[PDB]
RNA sequence: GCCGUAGACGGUGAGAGCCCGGUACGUGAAAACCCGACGUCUGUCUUGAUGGUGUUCCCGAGUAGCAGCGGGCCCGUGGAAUCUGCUGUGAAUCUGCCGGGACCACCCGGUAAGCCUGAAUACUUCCCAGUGACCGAUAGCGGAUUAGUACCGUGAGGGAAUGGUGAAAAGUACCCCGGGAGGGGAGUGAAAGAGUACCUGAAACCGUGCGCUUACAAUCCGUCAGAGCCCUCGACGUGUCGUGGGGUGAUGGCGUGCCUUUUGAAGAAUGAGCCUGCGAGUCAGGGACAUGUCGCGAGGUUAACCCGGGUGGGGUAGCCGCAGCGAAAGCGAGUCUGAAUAGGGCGUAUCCACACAAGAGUGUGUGGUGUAGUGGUGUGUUCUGGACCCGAAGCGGAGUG
RNA sequence: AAGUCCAAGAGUGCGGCAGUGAGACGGCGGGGGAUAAGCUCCGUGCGUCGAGAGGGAAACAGCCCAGAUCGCCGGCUAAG
RNA sequence: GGCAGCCAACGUGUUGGCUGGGUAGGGGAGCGUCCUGCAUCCGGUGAAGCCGCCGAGUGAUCGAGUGGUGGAGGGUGUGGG
């Protein structure tokens, strides 16, 4: 069970949190880790690309001249694949690439994820991003800049805090997310994950109970 | 993702027509006209890698037969006295001798008349 | 779309325990009269489908 | 660290696709089609055999009907009461669906398979002559619903 | 250096958070409309409710029911229930009537032949704001350009082609040749190898110059040897060799195009004038079989749907596995046939050891070891769909002549 | 009973995926034909072509020699 | 003398023995094109494209080798389509 102890903006250290050995050390699974983030992926994607097949463009509903005699091709449709402005014999279609993968795989490629940034020491647990009441880039650029000298940073803050996501939201490699929506492809994105205390115990209590 | 063939043909175009340099009338100008007489050209290359050998061992011979008969032995029984007296020069230096070395020719000459049997129609 | 099993195989062959798949044999319905005892004692029960007829018949049985 | 471009498929996961009339290199001018015929072009159902009668209509059909009013069991035997219960004690329907041994919300009747060595209190819809048997033999009741 | 609740996206003379339109975040309605709220106003109950006791009347008529002929139901007339159209016949008001898959009895459910009713559901001509492992001018809508235009048809109807100078026109003043067109100087411009025939500028095709070769010669037009001439790279003397490289080739040997389709084609069988673009095994489904790989594992897994600006979290209804045999009642490690402990069929994962029998092929019993499926996803086939692409003569519906 | 046995890349069982189901000539045994056909129909642990280049038969799918992984301006042979 | 397939021997990849014509067809491994997640590098001191030279690989092909023309985007590794 590695410790992680929690810093203020102030910089003084509150006091220390357990990272359950369950949620935070299991081993790392490439294959089950790589499976997930491109179901996520394939997820994202939207298919809005299309084509017309030579049933749905435009005339071409006539045979453009006799079958013999005339000395050339035999053609039945002046909208065949063939013809220029012709229809596509095999394009894309709208579709669905979103793919169901198992409750267990994901949680187990989450695991995964955070245990690595855990064994790297890649996890850090924060009070607050900065003191309340008010926004500030400067502030909350200052205090990350003590924290990790890595590029890309994942804050995990609650729903209700809008001072820290308005105050880290504009800062360049910075990706803010919510305890409940967790997910490999953003953990495995980050090169540090930088949790809110009551974030990092919402998460465990939700994991564990 | 809609591909364009572009760059992908002309690769392969360019590459044969450049082969096909030196050509006569539309085999050197027309990629499929090319193409055709690249594969012929291939397979008569690859035929006369083989048959050429024979050839220039032909030639060996023919030259080597002209001058053992200008030493008054012909081929047959020259071939026979080497192979008798354990010369192991081959027909290409053979003829190399013959053309370069006209004394040095007529010694193997009559190293072999002397290894060749007394009489060569004999059963033995 | 779903697959739709065939309806004549499904009610002509079934299957064992295992997976063997059974049928029924012929020339039993009529005209029982000038065929022996014998010959109709071995015409009936079941027997394993012949290793000729087991993939389309499975294919039937499945889709 | 690991990072999104340290992710690679299990050895042997992907395999690549066989595209098809590309070049007389791979699969050409057919695609694994032959020459001529019907099946140079389209199908052939798998019903058919050719103009004959068909395997499954010279065949008699299989005899008899289906009851739709039977009474249909999920059966559990002696010897999985005899490993799921060490300590005996009372097994009804809940705890036989709790560890396991038969689905949620059905029949349940006990069959004699294995053998039975514990104290064991049973109630269940229904049971075979042999498991009652093996259950009283071990001093246990075989209580009927 | 600075801002950041603003590092979205575009423009500006080449990759701009700090130059511009903007962006985050706030503000703004005279009037019209749309929502709500409180009222006038309208209606209704207040000549009113209750818990009880015993009998007559009423409870939707050309209706239900029945018969004939049809339609539709998983149900193609079948034993044909329920619903329903036309033609006949035609009942009762509650111990009545209708349904519980012919029908009858009993029990159960309901109360037809009167009428209204929101939400959950389906769609986008049109308007606003956005997005794309969508197209980038033979693509994408037929239409980026005069587009349902030009053109074709008597008509219904069919139906195109055509984008790019430059950062800015600064679009070449003036002179010369020329009737003009076009050009040469001179100027603009970073570039005129950007001159309104304009970014880049490939191939087919058509010239001009230079090098070698060719007018005694039977050539699928090449290939392998190869004299001579020419051009280069090195070493050395005045031109001669080399681990050389190129261009042409006098002369000698060998040599019957490509593809389809065939027993067999160079074939005097089929297709192709040439170049450049375009043009054929794809997708959907918890579909079926097989085979990889990953998770869990005697278990696996969710569908619809609910909550998240997301790819996340819930959701046990179902499905597959877990016992088989039998037409079925049923019985169950057995079961069916059968009068049979008498044989056979199917089944008890599979192996090992030990006994008992038999050498009609091995069987039967005791012990152990113990049983592997399921859900994602790659691949090959397959099913339903136009299903690898192209091609008829012809058949229907509605219209135009 | 042996042989081959760092191979025939042999047999047998099951499964995934096929193509084929128009053959030709030559040698032997036959039918039909006129003991004609480059005819037609069969048999053949017979062959070759098909799907096979190289050498010979002047040229000449099916005849004879011989089964082409590539290079060599080495040698020995087969039919001829 | 070079390469490849199957197998054996010994070892932490070499040697050896056999084998390597091929249509329909089956199997295995690859080149090139575009669009993309991630990570890196080049580019008005000149990207792509096109035309050459000099070369390279067993093949599809290659040139983060170089000239010309051109004027604004490319390369590479590892995955996805």
Redesign the interface.
């Known amino acids: 069970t590695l410790k992680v102890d929690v810093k203020t903006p102030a910089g003084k250290t509150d006091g220390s949190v357990e990272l359950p050995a369950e949620l935070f050390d299991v081993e790392p699974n490439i294959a089950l880790m790589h499976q997930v983030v491109t179901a996520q992926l394939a997820a994202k994607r939207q298919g809005t690309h299309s084509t017309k097949t030579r049933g749905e463009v435009s005339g071409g509903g006539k045979k453009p001249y006799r079958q013999k005699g005339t000395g050339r091709a035999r053609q039945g449709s002046t909208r065949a694949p063939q013809f220029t402005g012709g229809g596509t014999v095999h394009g894309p279609k709208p579709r669905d690439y979103s793919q169901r993968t198992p409750k267990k795989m994901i949680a187990a490629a989450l695991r995964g994820a955070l245990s690595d940034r855990a064994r790297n020491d890649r996890i850090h647990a924060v009070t607050e991003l900065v003191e309340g009441q008010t926004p500030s880039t400067k502030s909350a650029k200052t205090f990350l800049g003590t924290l990790t000298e890595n590029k890309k940073v994942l804050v995990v803050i609650g729903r209700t805090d809008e001072v820290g996501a308005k105050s880290v939201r504009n800062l360049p490699g910075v990706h803010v997310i919510s305890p409940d929506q967790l997910n490999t492809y953003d953990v495995l994105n980050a090169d540090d994950v930088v949790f809110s205390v009551e974030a990092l115990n919402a998460y465990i209590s939700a994991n564990s109970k | 993702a809609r591909v364009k063939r572009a760059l992908n043909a002309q690769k392969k175009r360019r590459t044969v027509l450049k082969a096909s340099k030196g050509y006569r009338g539309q085999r050197s100008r027309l990629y499929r006209k090319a193409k055709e007489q690249q594969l012929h050209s291939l397979t008569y290359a690859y035929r006369d890698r083989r048959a050429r050998k024979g050839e220039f061992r032909k030639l060996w011979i023919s030259r080597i037969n002209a001058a053992a008969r200008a030493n008054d032995i012909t081929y047959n029984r020259l071939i026979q006295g080497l192979k008798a007296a354990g010369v192991e020069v081959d027909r290409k230096n053979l003829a190399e001798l013959a053309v370069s070395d006209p004394a040095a020719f007529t010694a193997l000459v009559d190293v072999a008349r002397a290894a060749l049997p007394e009489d060569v129609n004999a059963p033995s | 779309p779903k697959a739709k099993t065939?309806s004549?195989?499904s009610?002509?062959?079934?299957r064992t325990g295992t997976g063997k798949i059974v049928?029924?044999?012929?020339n039993?319905?009529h005209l029982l009269e000038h065929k022996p005892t014998k010959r109709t004692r071995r015409l009936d029960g079941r027997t394993t489908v012949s290793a000729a007829?087991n993939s389309?018949?499975n294919?039937?049985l499945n889709g | 660290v690991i990072k999104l471009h340290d992710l690679k498929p299990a050895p042997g996961e992907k395999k690549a696709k066989t595209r098809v009339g590309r070049g007389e290199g791979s699969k050409g001018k057919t695609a694994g089609r032959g020459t001529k015929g019907t099946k140079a072009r389209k199908n052939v159902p798998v019903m058919f055999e050719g103009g004959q009668m068909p395997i499954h209509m010279r065949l008699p059909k299989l005899k008899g009907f289906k009851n739709r009013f039977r009474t249909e069991y999920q059966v559990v035997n002696v010897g999985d009461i005899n490993k799921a219960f060490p300590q005996g004690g009372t097994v009804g329907v809940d705890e036989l669906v709790a560890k396991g041994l038969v689905r949620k919300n059905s029949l349940v009747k006990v069959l004699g398979d294995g053998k039975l060595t514990v104290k064991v209190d049973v109630t269940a819809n229904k049971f075979s002559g042999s498991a009652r048997e093996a259950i009283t033999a071990a001093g246990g009741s075989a209580t009927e619903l």
């Open positions: 065939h004549g195989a009610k002509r062959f079934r049928r029924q044999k012929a039993r319905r007829d389309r018949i294919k039937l």
